[PDB]
Amino acid sequence: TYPKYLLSPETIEALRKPTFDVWLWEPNEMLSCLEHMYHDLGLVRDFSINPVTLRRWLFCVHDNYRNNPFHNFRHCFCVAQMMYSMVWLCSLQEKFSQTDILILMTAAICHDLDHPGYNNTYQINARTELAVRYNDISPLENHHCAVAFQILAEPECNIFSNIPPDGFKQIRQGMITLILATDMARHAEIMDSFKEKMENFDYSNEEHMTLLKMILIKCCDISNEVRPMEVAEPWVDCLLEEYFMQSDREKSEGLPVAPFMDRDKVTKATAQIGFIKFVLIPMFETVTKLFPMVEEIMLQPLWESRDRYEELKRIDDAMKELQK
């Protein structure tokens, strides 16, 4: 027997796949997983990351995620673990430099840092200190990003301490671009840009590759439904918990309420059907043009999830045919 934070060989192997059960593990075990990713991706080797600083940095990242129902440390773990899965699934180390892999992973981990559990529309409408600070420009994502680099600026947490300044600047710019790209209000703009590049994709074109990295981090961020139904499903309850908290607050503060956060309108099936059909499937279809193996491993579960939720909605609707 070994202290939980000693990962088993079985767990290490399972960690490479999108079927990994994100719910089984406590934070200390999740931190060890993330640690293992940096070593296993060769990032510790190639960026001379102090192994103790890596751990201190992950602990500090954990400390700066809030205990929200959804936008919490377990979410950043999911996003990073899906990114790690996609590196193996899509053979990303053939296409991307080690600096690009470092940017993808570190941005995945950092992308929702210190999230308050109320979205940008709330920040903007309530004129919060964050909205005022960032002039209504992706306030949350600007904040996640600032926090990321505030953490990295503390020497005991600086995993980049042994990278030259030019390397740091290159990584910094990449991470900012990616975390900013996680603002869903930009989803159609980013998808349109990507598809435009996808007309004639060029792996040696830097602009093409920046858009590919933004699509990968976006894929991983919104990827919960790619996972086995038993892993995916509790995430929806968590999300609706945050949505309903926000809309309750908006009501009692006299602010606009989004219909997709309305307790009397929204169900799991209504939340997921449109999202899978019109956001997730189309994005993964376009990625599958570059990476055909994504169809079987990620698009198949989405088709299955779509169909299950359509069945669910049909029974939810019937149940309400009994209620007035």
Place this chain on the structure above:
Amino acid sequence: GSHMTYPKYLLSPETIEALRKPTFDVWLWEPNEMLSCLEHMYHDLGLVRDFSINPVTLRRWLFCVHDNYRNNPFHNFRHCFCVAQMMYSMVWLCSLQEKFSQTDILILMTAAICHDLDHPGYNNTYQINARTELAVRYNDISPLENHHCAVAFQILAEPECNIFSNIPPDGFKQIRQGMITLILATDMARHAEIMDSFKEKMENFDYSNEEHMTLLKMILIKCCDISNEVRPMEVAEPWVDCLLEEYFMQSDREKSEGLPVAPFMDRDKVTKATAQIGFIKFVLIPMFETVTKLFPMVEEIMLQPLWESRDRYEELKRIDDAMKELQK
């Protein structure tokens, strides 16, 4: 030619008239007098009337804006007054009230006043290279200008300074979005991008097209911000000294901290003439030329002074070079 003497902050009729033109001598006035001028602009432009601005709040607001400008050699309360006063001048010269809604004039005037709030006296490149708290906060994206705009709205969120308190929320959102766009447009890193976009619309300008009008307003605030050389020589010249003072302070600090130094800020390489010639010829003149296509009255009033300053500085340099050659 009044009958008795009045406190300085009671503007004379002569001052009120002179205030409408780009020849206004910005150096004659103490802070309290400049505040009275700004106040007069809001009343005279009909902004107090059309937006139900409490006149006492307007004063409190202007005083709080003044308090939040730092005592920098160049990026100080007097500079904001210059930019605002040039904007006021351009409203009359270009008859902007025919083209623009009152909401638009409000955005232009208020952005002008607020555009350099709490400037630290070191530019974005310093912020970014030094990895300052501003640079980290704003993720290297126009850190100063984001900050100016944040401070503007921090002031406006205090009820005693909220000149927009009687504006409905939909009005506030429209005004806020416009001020943000304008203040962010003053980052000189974006100069060629904004000019290119504007020139593109200029191929077939449309005053009813909202994207065209947004770019026009961006060009207008940019014009006013860098408009010092449009002013009479005696008014314009001491501002060059102020600017170099900030530039040399920065390059001194960067040399000490081991950070990169920009040649245009290097006290070993820069003159008044050197500083201004290229800036006038290749930044100012071309920008005011594009504006003249929409507002041909701009040529006489604003390009002519720029041509004169260009020529005067080219002569100063020619003389500086003859001195150097004589010694070296």
